[PDB]
From a paper:
Targeted protein degradation via “hijacking” of the ubiquitin-proteasome system using proteolysis targeting chimeras (PROTACs) has evolved into a novel therapeutic modality. Herein, we characterize PROTAC-mediated ternary complex formation and degradation by employing von Hippel–Lindau protein (VHL) recruiting PROTACs for two different target proteins, SMARCA2 and BRD4. Inducing proximity between a target protein and a ubiquitin ligase complex can promote the transfer of ubiquitin to the target and subsequent degradation through the 26 S proteasome. PROTACs are constructed from two ligands that are connected by a linker. The nature of this linker, length and composition, and the attachment site of the linker to each ligand affects the affinity of ligands to each of its binding partners and the relative orientation of the two proteins to one another in the ternary complex.
PROTACs (1-3) bearing a common pyridine linker differ in the way the ligands (SMARCA2 and VHL) are positioned with respect to the nitrogen of the pyridine ring. A drastic difference in the ternary complex binding affinity (KLPT) for these regioisomers was observed with compound 1 promoting the highest affinity complex. PROTAC 1 demonstrated robust SMARCA2 degradation within 2 h in the MSD assay (lowest AUC) while 2 led to a right shifted AUC (two times >1) and 3 exhibited no degradation. SMARCA2 PROTAC 1 demonstrated the highest cooperativity (α = 12.8) compared to its closest analogs 2, 4 and 5. Attempts to solve the ternary complex crystal structure between VBC and SMARCA2BD with compound 1 was unsuccessful but we obtained a ternary complex crystal structure with its paralog SMARCA4. We modeled the SMARCA2BD ternary structure with compound 1 using this crystal structure by substituting SMARCA4BD for SMARCA2BD and performed MD simulations to relax the system. The SMARCA2BD-Compoud 1-VBC complex appears to be more flexible than its SMARCA4 counterpart. The three top models of compound 1 induced ternary complex from the modeling workflow are all within the structural ensemble generated from simulating the crystal structure derived SMARCA2BD-Compound 1-VBC system. Increasing the linker length of the PROTAC (i.e., 7) could cause greater conformational freedom, and could impart flexibility in the ternary structure, resulting in reduced total BSA compared to compound 1 which lends more structural rigidity to the ternary complex.
Author numbering:
A (entry chain H): 1455 to 1569
B (entry chain C): 62 to 204
C (entry chain A): 1 to 21, 27 to 42, 44 to 78, 85 to 103
D (entry chain B): 17 to 19, 24 to 49, 58 to 112
Write the structure that this text describes.
């Protein structure tokens, strides 16, 4: 992993800065910092492995991701969490689905165009 | 001792920076603790997603001078009636000419050199005592 | 609106404020008739109390930096003030 | 109603009331002289006086009171010696 982190950075940097085409909102801001235990006890209990981006940001910093395929299934787990806690069709729900295909479409561009 | 209430009830809020400083929005973590949020250019304003009952404190991001929001010391998001985002007008106070003269001096000399002025031995205390975040908290919490 | 100005005459000076649209106030304070008076930058001003028409809009004659006006039957250079020391610790 | 290295200046009485020290010399229990302060500092002082009243508790977007760097040392001792 010589610049493996450097490419994970771009990937996460791109997903967060994603803007809706009609609304323009950053569409990732709900998921940035997950509220605390004292302040949301029912999330941490219903959800097996809670995760938000701040943890992924600093998990990348510890470079505990051996692979990009490793990095994906965390960001994948992140939306899979929000899809269970939230109602099908709720704003948060339908957006976690969007970012799934945002991380999808972004992984292809980064890996190739840098050898 | 002084922090935000955990009502999950949201509150669309918007900060209008109507002052020449660079404003530093400060959220108060539920342990009384302050957490900082991105700075605001002087003329501009920005919309936010805050939650009702929370506490916001406002402050220059460079001198940490006392900044005024909505004409009062602090700002708590009320409920937005017709969806109208609540306005946190971040403006200046009217400092005492003593205080205003204090800020300009801190801007022109480094701390390792304050004491070399040929000025009153009292003002040295008044200079070396800088405007602080948590310090102003103990002052507001006191009664 | 409200314009804040500054009249000087041989180092004696008045701070007061009036509307964007005169000297009569001088007669009450200086107890000298108003017609004997009054200009800026060598351009007397006859028709008094029209304030703005000369350049004193609500942004130039503001409290933290008032606008200078002179007073006259004699012409005079109102005596300026002292100069700053520029102590060397700063900068 | 109204009131070189001395005072020599006239302002409204209420604008004078701004400073706490000058709420003491006159009307105790007119003219007032200052044997320390120059004539260039008293400009920026009574400018703060007018700047104080017009803007205090007026919800309008308050602008800064300005200070030239070559003036700071001597206004500060003043506003210290003025309780304002
Ligand atoms: C000021 C400023 N200038 C310039 S830019 C800017 C600015 C700063 C911050 C913000 C963010 C967006 N906004 C806040 O910072 C607000 C402003 C302050 O009042 C407080 N605040 C907080 O964020 C704190 N607290 C809470 O958010 C909190 C508390 C109690 N309950 C809460 N809920 C119930 C559960 N929710 C759900 C979450 C998820 C989910 C999330 C992540 C990953 C997976 C998931 O599944 N999924 N589904 C949900 N339903 C969320 C809402 C939230 C903080 C502790 C998190 C920092 C925006 C703009
Ligand atoms: Na957030």
């Amino acid at each position: 992993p010589p610049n493996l982190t450097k490419k994970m950075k771009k990937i996460v940097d791109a997903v967060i800065k994603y803007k809706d085409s009609s609304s323009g909102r950053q569409l990732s801001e709900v998921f940035i910092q997950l509220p605390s235990r004292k302040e949301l006890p029912e999330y941490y209990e219903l959800i097996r492995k809670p995760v938000d981006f701040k943890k992924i940001k600093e998990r990348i910093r510890n470079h505990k991701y051996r692979s990009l395929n490793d990095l994906e299934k965390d960001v994948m787990l992140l939306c899979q969490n929000a899809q269970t806690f939230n109602l099908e069709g709720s704003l948060i729900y339908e957006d976690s689905i969007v970012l799934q295909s945002v991380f999808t479409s972004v992984r292809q561009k980064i890996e190739k165009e840098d050898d | 001792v002084l922090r935000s209430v955990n009502s999950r009830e949201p509150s669309q809020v918007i900060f209008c920076n109507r002052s020449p400083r660079v404003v530093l929005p400060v959220w108060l973590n539920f342990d009384g603790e302050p957490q900082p949020y991105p700075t605001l250019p002087p003329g501009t304003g920005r919309r936010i997603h805050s939650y009702r009952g929370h506490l916001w404190l406002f402050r220059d991001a460079g001198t940490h001078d006392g900044l005024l929001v909505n004409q009062t010391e602090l700002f708590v998001p009320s409920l937005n009636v017709d969806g109208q985002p609540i306005f946190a007008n971040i403006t200046l106070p009217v400092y005492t000419l003593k205080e205003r003269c204090l800020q300009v001096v801190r801007s022109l000399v480094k701390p390792e050199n304050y004491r070399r002025l040929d000025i009153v031995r009292s003002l040295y205390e008044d200079l070396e005592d800088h405007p602080n975040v948590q310090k102003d908290l103990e002052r507001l919490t006191q009664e | 609106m409200d314009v804040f100005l500054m009249i000087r005459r041989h180092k004696t000076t008045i701070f007061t404020d009036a509307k964007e649209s005169l000297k009569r106030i001088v007669e009450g304070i200086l107890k000298r008739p108003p017609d004997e008076q009054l200009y800026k930058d060598d351009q007397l001003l006859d028709d008094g109390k029209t304030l703005g028409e000369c350049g004193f809009t609500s942004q130039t004659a503001r409290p933290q930096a008032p606008a200078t006006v002179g007073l006259a039957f004699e012409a005079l250079c109102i005596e300026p003030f002292s100069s700053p020391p520029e102590l060397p610790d700063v900068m | 109603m109204y009131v070189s290295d001395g005072h020599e200046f006239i302002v409204k009485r209420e604008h004078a009331l701004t400073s706490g020290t000058i709420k003491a010399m006159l009307s105790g229990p007119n003219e007032v002289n200052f044997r320390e302060i120059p004539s260039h500092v008293l400009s920026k002082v009574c400018m703060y006086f007018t700047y104080k009243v017009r803007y205090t508790n007026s919800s309008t977007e308050i602008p800064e009171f300005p200070i030239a760097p070559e003036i700071a040392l001597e206004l500060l001792m003043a506003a210290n010696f003025l309780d304002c």
